[PDB]
């Protein structure tokens, strides 16, 4: 039994170029809703999306086949460091942060994780705040209820 | 456990048993007036209500942090059929109809909505007939104007 | 048997190769080209980034004529298409002046021809050329290991 985790992110390409990142969680496939672009995934791309304005996302059910190979999230944000592509993430106080000059148009879309490779939130963009830089974000708390937080002047990535 | 959508009737307790419902339509909270109890949620329930005896619905604004979270509104109702919280319900003649033995004491305030997802009443309460059971109800025509339509011995749920 | 490892065709040229392994068929993601098998060249991929690999689960009536892997990996020789091979610190490594552009995917086996990696790249380091390969440990957790300044074959 060899167990491969496959790529559960993937980009959103727009002009030739990647505007943003989907992802599959939970059986659903989401997409920031103010990026647009197409997911460089045939399968993916084609399936039809209910819009959330209200957490500026979009999301489908994903196909059957793939109804396993999906992250699995949670709602346990203890104090610490999560991971993210660009590295370390911080969660303090009820905000993520990431090091200075790390983040930017682009990143939008892409999961944080935490050690046991469980999604805690979707990034959605940020605010540089001096050596650090705050993330907006959706969340979830232990009811399964979505939570959208945006920091003070926050820019969408 | 992923809720992406958010609740739009509430319950109002009563002695701890349901009493009636409560829903956000066009940005607004409704309640029936008949209908005594505390709303299940503190901040609809705090929210200082306008009365209009005429239609048997009290209202008030709703917090603009859910204004956008609330059901959409509809004038259009052509003959052909509806759901509710029970099922089926049919509009012909002037009026919604439901099978007997559905729709009770508890009902009132439970949104009426088309296959769009937008409210198109808003029930009060019924009356068997037969087979058949009528609703009294408020709607909307072409102005927005609000119109309540009782049938006949109708009884309040 | 015996053919178990299939090139990678690209305008005409073997960019590389890929194999079955374990139900599975592998293919280096940064090769292009079609797999030199229809049935292989057929199945739809799913991709594994972080392994710079592409793979998919191979029929059911396949199963058992694909290559049997290990996490075995004691210091030691082993083998591939240009011969031999070394396993010691947790790493491969072949002569100088052999391996190259066009062998990515080909398999490395133990002496009972198992699959014990798949090569990725590699860096000359001397008189030994350092290779990047995914692997296999005692969890049979797929694992990827790339020597510094390692280029991709």
Same mark, same amino acid.
């Given at each position: @039994?060899?167990?491969?985790?496959?790529?559960? !992110?993937?980009?959103?390409?727009?002009?030739?170029?990647?505007? +943003?990142?989907?992802?599959? @969680?939970?059986?659903?496939?989401?997409?920031?809703?103010?990026?647009? +672009?197409?997911?460089?995934?045939?399968?993916?791309?084609?399936?039809?999306?209910?819009?959330?304005?209200?957490?500026?996302?979009?999301?489908?059910?994903?196909? #059957?086949?793939?109804?396993?190979?999906?992250?699995?999230? !949670?709602?346990?944000?203890? #104090?610490?460091?999560?991971?993210?592509?660009?590295?370390?993430? #911080?969660?303090?106080?009820?905000?993520?942060?990431?090091?200075? %000059? *790390?983040?930017?148009? %682009?990143?939008?879309?892409?999961?944080?994780?935490?050690?046991? %490779?469980?999604?805690?939130?979707? *990034?959605?963009? %940020?605010?540089?705040?001096?050596?650090?830089?705050?993330?907006? *974000?959706?969340?979830?708390?232990?009811?399964?209820? !979505?939570?959208?937080?945006?920091?003070?002047?926050?820019?969408?990535?």
């Amino acid at each position: @039994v060899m167990k491969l985790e496959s790529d559960k !992110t993937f980009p959103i390409m727009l002009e030739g170029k990647i505007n +943003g990142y989907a992802c599959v @969680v939970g059986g659903k496939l989401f997409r920031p809703m103010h990026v647009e +672009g197409k997911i460089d995934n045939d399968v993916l791309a084609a399936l039809k999306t209910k819009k959330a304005s209200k957490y500026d996302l979009e999301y489908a059910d994903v196909p #059957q086949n793939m109804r396993a190979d999906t992250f699995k999230y !949670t709602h346990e944000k203890p #104090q610490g460091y999560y991971s993210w592509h660009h590295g370390a993430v #911080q969660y303090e106080n009820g905000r993520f942060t990431v090091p200075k %000059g *790390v983040g930017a148009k %682009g990143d939008s879309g892409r999961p944080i994780l935490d050690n046991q %490779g469980r999604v805690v939130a979707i *990034v959605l963009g %940020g605010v540089n705040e001096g050596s650090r830089t705050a993330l907006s *974000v959706v969340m979830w708390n232990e009811k399964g209820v !979505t939570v959208k937080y945006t920091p003070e002047n926050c820019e969408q990535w």
